[PDB]
Amino acid sequence: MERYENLFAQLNDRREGAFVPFVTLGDPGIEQSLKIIDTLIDAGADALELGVPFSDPLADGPTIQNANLRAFAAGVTPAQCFEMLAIIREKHPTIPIGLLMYANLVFNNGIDAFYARCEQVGVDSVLVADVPVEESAPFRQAALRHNIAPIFICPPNADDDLLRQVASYGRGYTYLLHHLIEKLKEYHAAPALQGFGISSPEQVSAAVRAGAAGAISGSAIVKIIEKNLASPKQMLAELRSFVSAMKAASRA
Amino acid sequence: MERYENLFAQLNDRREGAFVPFVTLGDPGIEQSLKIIDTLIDAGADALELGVPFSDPLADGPTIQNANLRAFAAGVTPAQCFEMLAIIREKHPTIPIGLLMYANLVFNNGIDAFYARCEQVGVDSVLVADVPVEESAPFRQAALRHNIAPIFICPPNADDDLLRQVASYGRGYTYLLHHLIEKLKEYHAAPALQGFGISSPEQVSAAVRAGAAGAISGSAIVKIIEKNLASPKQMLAELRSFVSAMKAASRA
Amino acid sequence: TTLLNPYFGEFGGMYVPQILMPALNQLEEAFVSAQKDPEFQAQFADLLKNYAGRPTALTKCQNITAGTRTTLYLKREDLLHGGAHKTNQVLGQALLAKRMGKSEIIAETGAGQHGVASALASALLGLKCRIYMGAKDVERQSPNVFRMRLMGAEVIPVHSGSATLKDACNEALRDWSGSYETAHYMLGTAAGPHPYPTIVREFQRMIGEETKAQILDKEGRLPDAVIACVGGGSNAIGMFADFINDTSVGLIGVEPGGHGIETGEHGAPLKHGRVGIYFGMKAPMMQTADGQIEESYSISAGLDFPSVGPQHAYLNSIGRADYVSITDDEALEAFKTLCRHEGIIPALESSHALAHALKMMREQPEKEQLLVVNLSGRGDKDIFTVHDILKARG
Amino acid sequence: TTLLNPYFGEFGGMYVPQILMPALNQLEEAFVSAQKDPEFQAQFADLLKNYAGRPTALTKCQNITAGTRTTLYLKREDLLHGGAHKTNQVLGQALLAKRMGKSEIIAETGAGQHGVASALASALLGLKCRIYMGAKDVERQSPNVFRMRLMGAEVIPVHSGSATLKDACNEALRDWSGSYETAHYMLGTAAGPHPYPTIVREFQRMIGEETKAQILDKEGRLPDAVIACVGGGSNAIGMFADFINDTSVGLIGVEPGGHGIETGEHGAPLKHGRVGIYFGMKAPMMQTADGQIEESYSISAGLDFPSVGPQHAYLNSIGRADYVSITDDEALEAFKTLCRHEGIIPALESSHALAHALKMMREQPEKEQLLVVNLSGRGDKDIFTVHDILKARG
């Protein structure tokens, strides 16, 4: 499929930036998570970045660490995550869906089998948090064979060689964590989405203004979940409110 | 004075062996101790061996260790021991009185001063438990200058040289702890008194029969004290009984 | 790209977030430079000798082997300053940190032995040290915790995940990810992302080098086998390294069998785990059928690393080294045996290695064999643990 | 009569019941013979090197002395097998026991360090070992107690007297008095009746011999002073011996000042006691005006011997050695300082010596001086003690 390509094309025709929220699948429960995800979509999320709970998320901060704790407390497994993914896609045919995975869960029962499963449920991309470009070959290859976009993080200091590799290896979008944006475009990298720290509407407008195709809210969404655990209803209401504001900030 | 010489002379004229009980001065209290000592004398003790409580009686067994504990519990000090000695001698002019001391108490404020004090209260001999003949010169000299008999232990294995030294250095009596007895007499040692294990009348008769001038009951008396702590009256009654039996066994 | 091969066969690699690669590459470069710098080597040798106490003794155990044809020597890392072999490589890594102009040290620890070693090296070399330790471990390691603080180190409890060593491992990386410019991550075993398995081996290889010289001196030949416990693999690779090219010398690594392999409660991922990717490396892992990482269980706190160094997985795959396991009860029996017959109280970790040598001896008493057991640490720290067990069992 | 002088000036002697003299004479004879027997020396050297870990390191302490003209080295007896210098002479005495055809060992211990050393030596050399320990000490030394039993030794509590070290000392003698035919009394310090002060010094003198060779190697000259704590006097005489004829080398012995000399609660009989006769020797004693022997008090369990070796009293009298005292608080501060600035946790006993060197340095920071402190033991054993105090003082 070409969901990311189709999405960015449309956002461009509207001089619009993309807003992509991240949430942990199954947090705080499978049922509430499916409701949380439908609310993010209804509120205007252009794409989704979904995490699969992993025992040792050595690339995540406290907020996400706790999201996983909550998901595991609910008994969430990768298998259930893939069942949720199928349900999500069945309800929303065009929104791009990207997974944020840890290498072991992809490698566990065969890298190829994992991407084949991603393709089957309708996932569009996979960012493997602990697989640098240097170790990415088998992952990138399996992804491409299964029409899955392999996504890479372009770190702050990314030297030229890295910029070139990320531009050459990535698809869908480049996870950006001016010159950086110019070089990525110069090397024809997948559209860059600004991540990290994106937690306010003004940051979304600033990212698009800097040249990025959009912004990813890596943890602001999870915080809202964590704060309203007491009232599921208020949780969704606040999620809807935040995403609405964030997305609106991306418009021209 | 010549109390030991006078005593052995008399015992010889009666073909009698000497019986000498040992007790710790001040055990279990000064008053009861004075009564215990008068009872031993009334019951027939020919001489006395009296210990002065010392903190670390490294040459004594459990029975005596506990006698010291009791004496110290009563606040007994060497000074009080010397006051008791004066009272004892004032009541009994001829019985030989020997002290069983630890070196530190003799050395503490001057070896000469200690023997001078012994002479003043009327003590006849001093056996320093932890002063072997090899280290005895200053002790022996001070003793003799103050008319105190220095007493030495002749151990089981005492080789010939030791027998000769003990025979030459000791006075009053030799603390024996056949051949041994013959050699001592051969080297003109002070009359030998058999010690250690002397706790029954038959042992007293056996010692005299072997050639010894008598026997010292090193701890049997203290045991009796320890057993009747509950009833002071019964204590003295039993002490009187035992000593009477022991002394009787020494007679011809 | 790298200067050195990050893999041992299929095992190893650098599976870290992109943001950490510069730190690994920087470290690898400094290490390669240090290794060719006679001045660095002389400074490292000086600290090992005059501060840590090397060379350590090689002690023959006649009382233990009497009546058999086994001759057993114990490489005495228990006599190294700190009480365990950990001290060797923390001194080398601390010197590397300084060579890179770093002033701070980050370390992870389970049993607290490595934490204590990192703290003492940092105290000696003027580095500000912070140690991550799983909350469950801090709880059962208050003595080592206090030692770390007396030495000026900051001890940070990790409550995330199972609150054990693997969790402290993640937190260390997380921290380093944002501070490597001024802080060096002093990893405690021969595992993790390249160049760590390589650096730790090289900074522990004097164990084997000394053992070889000592055994040649005393027996005029190489050992028939060298035996070492394997938690993460540092003391074992330290002992094995110099003997790898001596094909006649068996290399036997001993993983904790815990209550028994069949019970599932063990810490033997190399022979009873499944290859996975975690802690920056591809190696045999203690993990669910699902791919979630699990803990290693053992009566010994120090054999808790839920994976194993990639080089051991590699030496095992080609048949150069053999790995076995020893249960809690077997390790306890070796612990008692060494105390009673040699007057040496071994760490419970090391006791697993001794227990296996005792088995090699006892199963075939007339087999002529010259063995060396790496006594990775002293067991004063395990006295309470052993006491309770023996008392509990009446 | 004896083969060797039982006295050091007016101090020493053999003040034991006559029944024990044959045992002392027998021991003195075997010792003189052993000392002239190259085979005994080679066997003792072998155990010290391959089992105990000698030579021990001599560690320079630049972090501690920075900014001053003091250069400080620590003789690392804390790295000796067992964790303290005690191990040296128990191995020599155990070998002596065997030379005399003895199969059993009797020992006394206060802190339990010597008890543990006697047990490990006995375990290694096949001797049946029994240890007397004052009941108050067994109570506060259960870790060391258990170690002794793990090593097969029989630990016997002594409830007589104050139930401390002096009491265990008496009980040991009492026992030996009736068993010396088959048992050797392994006295733990350089005190007691001749030949013990002499034997213990000779079996500890490698401390000073190594220190001299190490200091000449590293500084090209002898130290301006060597400093050691003094409980009974063994680690100090072990360090001092080889330097006695080097008149330029100061010998500084450090007694525990406890809560302060003026409080009366201390363990400094050499400089603040009175000569007496006890434990088979004439020497400065902690004693009442009456002559009853008292206990030595110190925050450190190991400086509890209520007297001091006769040779120290003698070296003090002629002015060859100087003795000072260090309080509990001063020793605690040195303990903390060494942990924080050198990553070495010193025994609280040894901390008294380091505390005095720190005073020599700090009082006259521009005085050029080369000092060596004998670090008689490691302080892992003192961690609980220090923890509580620091916590108690908030």
Ligand SMILES: Cc1ncc(COP(=O)(O)O)c(CN[C@@H](CO)C(=O)O)c1O
């Ligand atoms: C004496 C001793 N012997 C063996 C090991 C196992 O590790 P190794 O396999 O790396 O040698 C350890 C590990 N200790 C680790 C993990 O708990 C630590 O953080 O301290 C040890 O302390």
Ligand SMILES: Cc1ncc(COP(=O)(O)O)c(CN[C@@H](CO)C(=O)O)c1O
């Ligand atoms: C590390 C260390 N440093 C110093 C001393 C003091 O004794 P020393 O003066 O004989 O050297 C001791 C004594 N220890 C004695 C008395 O308690 C024992 O029985 O173990 C020690 O254990």
Ligand code: NA
């Ligand atoms: Na492991």
Ligand code: NA
């Ligand atoms: Na003392």
